[PDB]
Amino acid sequence: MYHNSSQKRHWTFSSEEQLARLRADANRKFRCKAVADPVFLEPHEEMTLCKYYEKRLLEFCSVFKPAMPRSVVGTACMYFKRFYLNNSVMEYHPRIIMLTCAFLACKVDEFNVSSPQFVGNLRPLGQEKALEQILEYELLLIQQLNFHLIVHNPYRPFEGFLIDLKTRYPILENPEILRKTADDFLNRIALTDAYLLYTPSQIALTAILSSASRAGITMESYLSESLMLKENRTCLSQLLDIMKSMRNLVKKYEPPRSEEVAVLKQKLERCH
């Protein structure tokens, strides 16, 4: 369960400054190791490349056959983010790392698929070389996660909140209409670093109430009355602050641009 999992104890961080400091430390450590010059990359360029390759991992999981369950994709993305918290894209190429993350996520989430199908999903000699690289980097990826493999996703909390709304929120006539926009906002949240700062239940509730707001339906009574937060207004204020911070985090997200990404790919290929 999340409330005593390793994700809550070790991979949920106080603020974005912690993540920026960790990434800067990783880049500085790689630079110090390499020194003992414009070839190196700045931390923000590393962030842009990481966003681009997380997008590539998303499309790879979307194309994958047999169809990948959503939990596998979420676990793989979480693995990518966790790995590149403490590691530089210059030491390890994200192109191999994302495939290794998908491989390890399929193994962990009990999506039993043999290696030949996995490589066949890749667009034969290149497939064999990619498989060999995944074999080489699997144990490294496991070590960089500190042997913390269970990833708690917000999809099941989303379903549980939908059930609770269907049961004890009659004034909202049909919670099913709060599904498309809620899922889209959940994806947008997944694009940001909210997975390393907030609990899956908080993310799910934020998506649900964002979808409600887009539809014009206010559900402050659901938190106050149905969720029994009238007993503690401080907890309600904390939850509202967390949700507002999540919405602002989604608002300020900057998608990578094609030209900047192409220049960064050239630079990174030079580093390799």
Binding site: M1, Y2, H3, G160
Partner: protein, 65 residues
């Protein structure tokens, strides 16, 4: 030296979740898919899935790093 049962105390940092046997009375099961007789034969009920979904929905909702 007699034994006395005491329930497990695990802080979940979230709203209270109704008991498994109470789910049918409260009306949750009307919004979860019914268990097939094949599933019921092996001991799987829709109440288990509903309880798991509610527990994950309410887990850690009131916790901050």
């Amino acid at each position: 030296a007699l034994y006395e049962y005491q329930p497990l105390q695990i802080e979940t940092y979230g709203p209270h979740v109704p008991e498994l046997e109470m789910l049918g009375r409260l009306g949750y099961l009307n919004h979860v898919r019914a268990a097939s007789p094949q599933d019921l034969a092996g001991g799987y009920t829709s109440s288990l899935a509903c309880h798991r979904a509610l527990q994950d929905a309410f887990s850690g909702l009131f916790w901050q790093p």
